[PDB]
């Protein structure tokens, strides 16, 4: 996952 996770 690239963002948030």
């Amino acid at each position, epitope marked *: *996952y*690239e*963002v948030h*996770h």
Partner: antibody
Amino acid sequence: LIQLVQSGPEVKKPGETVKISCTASGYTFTNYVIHWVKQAPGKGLKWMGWIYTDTGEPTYADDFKGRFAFSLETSANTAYLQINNLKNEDMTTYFCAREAYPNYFDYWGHGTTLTVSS
Amino acid sequence: DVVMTQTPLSLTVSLGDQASISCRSSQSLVHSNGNAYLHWYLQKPGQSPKVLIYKVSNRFSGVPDRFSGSGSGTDFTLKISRVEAEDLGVYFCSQSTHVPYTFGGGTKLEIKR
């Protein structure tokens, strides 16, 4: 072939509880985040939140913190949406979606329609 | 929430012609990592939405090359070249730069016959 399949149409009275399922096949369930998306009025889309399939930790959009609960049965590759104390405004279609690693939704459930009526 | 505004609400395109849909965000969609997490979905009548374009311009596997996305900051465009009948339905822009994730109101593509 990857598929998200949802449980069939639901018909509830106001104030009742419903629990909708989202079953994933064709990949390692615990490696992807599952989201819930509501069909907004005028056939718009509204993000409800996600659940981490590895930790079971849910994140709700503000409007879904009160009456909505995400849960897992990871051994059944299944995510659940539970709605308590059903309201008229809950009456719509609910989608589950898998989040791709570049943070878009790659696979969607076909949807579950919820009727709220006396 | 980041508000996603689509224009037009509806467009009518002849087979083989080009459709252009605009999406404007209430905040920059440029993430701290320098990418914009702006995606396009098509929802056909009675179906779930399906991704066409992710991160502004990336085509999802099996999406024809006549779908192209562009833009930066707050202003994004989906272009559908060589429109085909099965293109009809509701196009949504969506952002996942920010939580909550948000959707545009949709643009209905109508085929001219």
